[PDB]
Amino acid sequence: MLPISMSDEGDSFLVKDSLGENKIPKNPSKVVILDLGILDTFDALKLNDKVVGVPAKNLPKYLQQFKNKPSVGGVQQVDFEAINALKPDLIIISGRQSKFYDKLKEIAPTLFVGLDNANFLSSFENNVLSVAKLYGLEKEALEKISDIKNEIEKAKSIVDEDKKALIILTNSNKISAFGPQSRFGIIHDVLGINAVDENIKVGTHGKSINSEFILEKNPDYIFVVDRNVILGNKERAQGILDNALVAKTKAAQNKKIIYLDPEYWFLASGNGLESLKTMILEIKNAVK
Ligand SMILES: [Zn+2]
Ligand SMILES: [Zn+2]
Numbered sequence: 001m002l003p004i005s006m007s008d009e010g011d012s013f014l015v016k017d018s019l020g021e022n023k024i025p026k027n028p029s030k031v032v033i034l035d036l037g038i039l040d041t042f043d044a045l046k047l048n049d050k051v052v053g054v055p056a057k058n059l060p061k062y063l064q065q066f067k068n069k070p071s072v073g074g075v076q077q078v079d080f081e082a083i084n085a086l087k088p089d090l091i092i093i094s095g096r097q098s099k100f101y102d103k104l105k106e107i108a109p110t111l112f113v114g115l116d117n118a119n120f121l122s123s124f125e126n127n128v129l130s131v132a133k134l135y136g137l138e139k140e141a142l143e144k145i146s147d148i149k150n151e152i153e154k155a156k157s158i159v160d161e162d163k164k165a166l167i168i169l170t171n172s173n174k175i176s177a178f179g180p181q182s183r184f185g186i187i188h189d190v191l192g193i194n195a196v197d198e199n200i201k202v203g204t205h206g207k208s209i210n211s212e213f214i215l216e217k218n219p220d221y222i223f224v225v226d227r228n229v230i231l232g233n234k235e236r237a238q239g240i241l242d243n244a245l246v247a248k249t250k251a252a253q254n255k256k257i258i259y260l261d262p263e264y265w266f267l268a269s270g271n272g273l274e275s276l277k278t279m280i281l282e283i284k285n286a287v288k
Helices: 036-044 061-066 080-086 095-105 120-135 138-158 211-217 227-231 262-268 273-287
Strands: 005-008 012-016 021-025 031-033 051-053 090-093 110-112 164-171 174-178 207-209 221-226 257-260
Touching: 012 120, 021 110, 031 036, 036 061, 036 120, 036 262, 036 273, 051 080, 061 262, 061 273, 080 095, 090 095, 095 110, 120 138, 138 273, 164 211, 164 227, 174 211, 221 227, 221 262, 221 273, 227 262, 257 262, 257 273, 262 273
Parallel strands: 031 051, 031 090, 090 110, 164 221, 221 257
Antiparallel strands: 005 012, 012 021, 164 174, 174 207
16 A cells, blocks of 8 residues: 655645645644544544544544544544534544545545555554654654564564464354454464464455364464444354354363454554554463
């Protein structure tokens, strides 16, 4: 994916990203943020007062300090009347709102902070550092990125050389597997946990699988992201996976069926200083 690039034009930056080009004022003071990871980065950098709208319908528990901000709807169910009312100087989006880019760009400069699943850390650092440059906080952001890299190193220290993981998303009663360079790929691509099939190629929604598959593969770890939790559905991964086939796996027998927090893994996607730190530590705690 194309990175964000920024040029100094005095009172503003000329910014190019994979969706287009924007003139963004320095120190934007009225920012509408539609990417939850970036909202967490604002919080980390003490930029809370700059934030004028958030997608309150999908506001994670870890970001409840933003519960009094004006709502602009949800990450998919965007309230354009509400956005227009706030008269933002900047709107920040990621992939779920790329379909709305032209409409948003008629409200305010609209910055895209996408994540490249083939180059996650590169994408991450670019997004954080570009936001920080708007405010003259590169030094502070670098320090926080360095700290996350140290935590990655520490986590890698305890990762097993040989054990293998399956990464699955559950939605309704469907189980979909993900691998390297896909969504949720950082468990492999960043932390180096081996995948049960390293050469698996999946689409955007993963590879539909069943419990016979899971047992055939016999993973050492099963990392689960339960989208049922986000939807408020009846079924949950714990019930889906409570069967005699899954029980026979190394993961089940070793209590290494790990239910990852979907507010971080599905909603924030690790696109923030807070979320990514937390997610690295979450994995570390699961495998150590
Ligand atoms: Zn060795
Ligand atoms: Zn590998």
